[PDB]
Structure 1
Amino acid sequence: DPMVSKGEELFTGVVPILVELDGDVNGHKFSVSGEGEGDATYGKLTLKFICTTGKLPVPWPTLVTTFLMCFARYPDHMKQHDFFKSAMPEGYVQERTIFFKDDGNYKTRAEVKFEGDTLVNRIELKGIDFKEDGNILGHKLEYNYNSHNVYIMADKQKNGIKVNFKIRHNIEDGSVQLADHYQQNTPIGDGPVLLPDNHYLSYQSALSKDPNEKRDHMVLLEFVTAAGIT
Structure 2
Amino acid sequence: LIKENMRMKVVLEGSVNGHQFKCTGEGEGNPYMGTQTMRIKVIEGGPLPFAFDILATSFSRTFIKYPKGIPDFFKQSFPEGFTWERVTRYEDGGVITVMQDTSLEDGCLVYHAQVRGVNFPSNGAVMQKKTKGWEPNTEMMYPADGGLRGYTHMALKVDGGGHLSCSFVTTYRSKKTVGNIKMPGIHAVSHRLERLEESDNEMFVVQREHAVAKFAGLGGG
User: How many angstroms apart in 1 are the aligned matches of 2:216 and 2:90?
Assistant: 31
| Residue from 37, 40, 60 that aligns with 2:52 | 60
2:171 aligned with 1:171: no
TM-score by length of 2: 0.91
Deviation at 1:187, TM superposition (A): 1.3
SS of the residue 1:11 aligns to: coil
User: How many angstroms apart in 1 are the aligned matches of 2:4 and 2:163?
Assistant: 38
**Unmatched runs of 5 consecutive residues or more in structure 1:** 1-9
- Letter matched to residue 30 of structure 1: F
Deviation at 1:56, TM superposition (A): 2.1
Cα deviation per residue 1:29-71 (whole Å; 9 max; x = unaligned)?
Answer: 1111111102112111011111112212321221122111111
1:208 aligned partner? 196
Cα deviation per residue 1:86-128 (whole Å; 9 max; x = unaligned)?
Answer: 1111111100000011221000000011011110110000011
2:90 aligned partner? 100
Cα deviation per residue 1:154-174 (whole Å; 9 max; x = unaligned)?
Answer: 012xx2110111110011011
2:120 aligned with 1:151: no
2:76 aligned with 1:69: no
Structure 1 ranges of 4+ moved more than 6 A: none
- Letter matched to residue 167 of structure 1: M
TM-score by length of 1: 0.88
- Letter matched to residue 124 of structure 1: Q
2:128 aligned partner? 138
Asked whether the 8 Å contact 1:103–1:134 carries over to 2, the reply is no
User: How many angstroms apart in 2 are the aligned matches of 1:25 and 1:229?
Assistant: 34
Structure whose residues are more often helix by fraction: 1
User: How many angstroms apart in 2 are the aligned matches of 1:70 and 1:94?
Assistant: 12
- Report the identity percentage: 24
2:23 aligned with 1:32: yes
User: How many angstroms apart in 1 are the aligned matches of 2:198 and 2:169?
Assistant: 32
User: How many angstroms apart in 2 are the aligned matches of 1:126 and 1:106?
Assistant: 6
Deviation at 1:229, TM superposition (A): 6.3
2:183 aligned partner? 195
Structure whose residues are more often strand by fraction: 2
1:218 aligned partner? 205
For the aligned residue pairs, the C-alpha RMSD in angstroms reads: 1.8
Deviation at 1:194, TM superposition (A): 2.6
Asked whether the 8 Å contact 1:49–1:219 carries over to 2, the reply is yes
Cα deviation per residue 1:169-209 (whole Å; 9 max; x = unaligned)?
Answer: 01101111111111101112323223210001111221021
1:4 aligned partner? none
Deviation at 1:224, TM superposition (A): 1.0
- Count the aligned residue pairs: 215
